[PDB]
Amino acid sequence: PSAVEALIETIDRHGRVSLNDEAKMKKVVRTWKKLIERDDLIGEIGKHYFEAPGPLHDTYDEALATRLVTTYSDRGVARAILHTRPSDPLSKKAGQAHRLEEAVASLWKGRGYTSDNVVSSIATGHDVDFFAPTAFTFLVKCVESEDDANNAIFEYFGSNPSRYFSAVLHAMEKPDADSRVLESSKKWMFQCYAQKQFPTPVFERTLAAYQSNHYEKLSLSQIEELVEEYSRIYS
Amino acid sequence: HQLLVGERDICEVLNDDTIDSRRFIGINLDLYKNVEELNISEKALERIHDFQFVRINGKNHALHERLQGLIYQSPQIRSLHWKCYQNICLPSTFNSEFLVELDMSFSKLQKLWEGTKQLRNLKWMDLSYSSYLKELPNLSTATNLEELKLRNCSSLVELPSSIEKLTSLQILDLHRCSSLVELPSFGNATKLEILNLENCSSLVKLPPSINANNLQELSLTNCSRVVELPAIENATNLWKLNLLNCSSLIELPLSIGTATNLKHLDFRGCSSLVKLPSSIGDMTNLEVFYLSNCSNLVELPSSIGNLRKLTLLLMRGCSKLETLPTNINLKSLHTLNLIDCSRLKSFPEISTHIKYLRLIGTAIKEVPLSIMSWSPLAHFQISYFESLKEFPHALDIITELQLSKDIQEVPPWVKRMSRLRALRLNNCNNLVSLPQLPDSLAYLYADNCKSLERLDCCFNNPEIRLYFPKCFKLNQEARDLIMHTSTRNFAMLPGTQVPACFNHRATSGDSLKIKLKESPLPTTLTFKACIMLVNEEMSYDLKSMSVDIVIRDEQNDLKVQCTPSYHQCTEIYVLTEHIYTFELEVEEVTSTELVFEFTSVNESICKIGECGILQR
Incomplete structure (x- = not known):
């Protein structure tokens, strides 16, 4: 299939399979790298998860961040954020990475984390x-x-x-x-x-x-x- | 080229007084190991051998005095990359006539040069993270310059006045220059391609106008004192424009609508933005349009109808917003997010294919009879007001209600309300009882009801979340109903110990021993678990909780499968003295005793303490 469908089904399978802690800490980075490969993926998957049934959010990035944090834990997401920093800040990959990181930061603020x-x-x-x-x-x-x-x-x-x-x-x-x-x-x-x-x-x-x-x-x-x-x- | 990769193992080659020192076009060093001075003979400092490609990787607090002697005496230095320069200024003997690239990505410089030098063929200058830089040189005679990346130069007070003469500039990254207080006028032919001013907390003035025929990105993501914005002349191919948190921005350039290929506009946090320009509707393909906390935005222009591709219109906290545009039909609008807009005073009728309509906190107080002409609403949320009974057309479409603090009694006609899927009470400090709720209900968030002692319902939705945080006053028959309602989701309740109905209690931990009630004549077995949380520092706002469940048998060793195997809720509260319950489903177990280990994902937010279960 295409990239969007494959990555969505991968995220769903990982979410519902109830995988090991080390397995999630290993697969979160692979999924995370797949996300920032091209600039038309974060938006499309965010839009898909926004429209899907569930809680209601304010943005597409918040929907994607919520689904990622629900699938791979709060520590897995932080692990993926720290170990997937591209080199040139003005690139497209760095822009997508900053989008994901800011979405996760706002997610954690919205839940009243200290x-x-x-x-x-x-x-x-x-x-x-x-x-x-x-x-x-x-x-x-x-x-x-x-x-x-x-x-x-x-x-x-x-x-x-x-x-x-x-x-x-x-x-x-x-x-x-x-x-x-x-x-x-x-x-x-x-x-x-x-x-x-x-x-x-x-x-x-x-x-x-x-x-x-x-x-x-x-x-x-x-x-x-x-x-x-x-x-x-x-x- | 093929770089002379060496780490303190080329410095011995240069000591040789032979011509072998000469004919080294490229030098590549790595000085991670600390030393004040390279062991070089004073006779090699006299030799004037030249380098063209210099790539040195410096070391913190290690000012190599001799290395600067050999490098900068080279007349034709084509390229220069000295990370962690560790010196106040570039040496006065430097000859930069043939310089084509410059890169000091970490430095302790304070001013590069004394006077206007020749930069005829300089094409790149990266000075990132030079936190101690005070001023750039006279950048005149730098015509061929392409990029100027001053990322995160905190101490840069002002840019040179001669920036107007960089007629070939393409990229200007001034990301976090927290002390820069003015951006000079750029010129009529520069045509910046990426103007990045993200975190300039002290920037005030901006150019009156900039050429923008070839412009893709323009970021001002925390510039809190930008009074106005330079005119964007053509912007035929803008890709990114975000003004997040840009307070003190009074208006917007009237040419912002010339960007006919922009697809996402984000003005969240733009307080004191009085009104949007009338040219907004000129934008085509504008799909997502964020506004949030935009106080003083008193009106929203009626030119929106030209958009024809808008999908998401987020508008939160727009306190001063009064009137949305009328007589429009946005063809592709999907969600209208109008929450906490205090002064709306009029129903939003700007489309017909809306699917998510969020109207909470708005002082709307009516519903038009035209909604049956609309497309079906998958989410229509309005904060309850007393004069809602007069709108029978609004009751069968509604999906979420929200009672306010000063509600004396939930109306009995809520049972008639058909497609209701939630009912959130927000600190109903004067209430007594809850009536029968519609069977379509799937959420009941009684947040902090001081007195809600009585529940008079029998919920029969298999997936219902009965969250009753900090709702202490409750007769036992209510607390019995909340715990014993069959639902495949969580259920909250204020409590101090796991109740007695959960017989097979166990201490604070993740090891529960239970015994099968009989020989398992029924194949499947149903368990009702109860869980408290370890007393530990809890934020007043902790709002996320997930649970893992694993079942293993000790009489015979085999990890028995569990059907639910996890419960996750991103809206539940995390509180210390509270009881959490859920359901469990198992196979037909050949054993007679099982072990439940109720762990919890995110062990850094909450850990499971006392937990006992029962068998049904």
Whole structure:
């Protein structure tokens, strides 16, 4: 058959077959890549799923996002979004990918997800992955403000500045890391300890106490970077 | 060419004082490993060997002083790609006469050049993610330029005044230049092909007009301070035009309707947009047309009738909207989405083939006698008003009702209402009882009724969803009916423990042991499950819940099949102290005891706690 009919029947079969978690995490990416291959697929399938019986939506993209999230779980959709980022943002593939990602973000907002639900859905297991740009931008999309996204990541680490700083330092090494945003997160942590009127030089011993899932235990307590910088940025 | 792929393993070749250093047209480096300076002899810094294709992949916080010595001394540098440049400015010795491409996709530059240099044959300049850039050079004498991709340059305060002379520009990506406050006039022959200004939170002014004969995309998706929009002269082949969240936009260019091939128009969030232009109807093939939260949009132009291809007309929260156009018949309209339009005050009669008519929150208060001439409505939703009894032609077509907060009693004539498939009560703070509902009912969303103690019905639709969130006042015969109504969908109820009717209770977890009531003389068996959720932080708005079900036998090991095998509802609420029930269907099991493991998809939103079942 054609591409639209084949992809629709694939999505329906996957939805009703009640497949394994690893099977869904593997098939969501294949379906997702099939979706963004050409620019006349998202619209046509969205229009088809809009008219089909069920709940009523406001857009076609919302209908497609609802069906995708229902078939492959909230974590499967996030997995497909993070691992299917095309290279050139001005291409047709990138446009379709952004359409799908924004539809899913609005879907999650419409269900009253908090920052913690979104972070736990994106969560992959490695604490460094939350600061990769392809995940940080989606998180900011879902929470609407970088401060709230940073707070959500900080709380997901058990409110532990040691783990947070280790993750940010590891994200510094990343090749395509938007260093401005990484310094924005580091500056946010410094600030949230700063205006608190907690300008004690003991920030060193607070970090030492908060340090020893599991993570790289920064032994590099950055007595200047993570201390002298706090020393002369404020007070 | 065949690139000299090397990672710190070409730097030894350049130390040789022989002519072997010369005759290297292309150099390709990868400096992921950190080092301040490449181990190069000072004698090789004197040699003036030239490079034409330079492709260097830099490293953060590693300013290679010597690598800049050998590279930029090359006179004929045709191409240049230095990711993570890590220097304040390009060296003053650079000769860019023959430059054809430039690409510094991550950088710490602050101004490229001191003075107006020669860019006669520059054709590409990508400076993306140069967050520390302060100003572009004097882009005059850059006539042959084609693309200028300044994506995500946060600190770029202003574009050069000499942009008018880029008579060959095709692409100008200024995606998230959050500090740019003015877009200079472009010129009479540039003919931009992609004008991308997506997230310019501080952009104010725009060119008075731009040539648009060859224009396909024009994105302003969060420009919150764009006062007006440049005139789009021809736009014969626009493909994309979205002005999402563009508040402060007062009007629209009157030439927007010249785009005769545009097929989707999105103005969601465009607050303070007073009126659409009268040329909107000139658009052909315009299929999807979004408006949402468009406050101050007081009228919708009557030129719409020319569209002939419109399919979806979304209009939510259009508070100031007063009068839709009359005496039109949109041939191919499919859904008219008019929700929360407070000041509508008049029925929407603009088509005859509408299939989804959503009219909730509108102060309509009448229904015309002309609807029997319309095509059958698959979804006609109107918020209930008291003076609805006078319209017997509106009762048999209606599909969804919605009682308001200040409803003293649901009218007894709802039973006459034939094709009703839902009845949503929204915090009916002064109610007592619910009458008999029509048997076509398939949804009952009693959201937060403070007092709904009595239910006086017997639902007989096999697929009905009796959701009663936060509806505490309920006599036990009502709670018995909600739980024991035979439906193949969910059912909500406020509760604190799984009731006693579900005998085979089990602790908080996913392991239920039940025993067959007898030797299974009936082949099939029917189970009614009950489920609470683990107490955990719950958002006041959590609205999605799905469940997986797996049945395995322990006396004999075999994964017995289950017929429903999952329940999913995207409208149900997720609340802690609430009881969720559903139905189960099984084969003829040769065993005598079975194990039910009620898991839940999306373990990161809600987990199943106490859950006991029963056999019918």
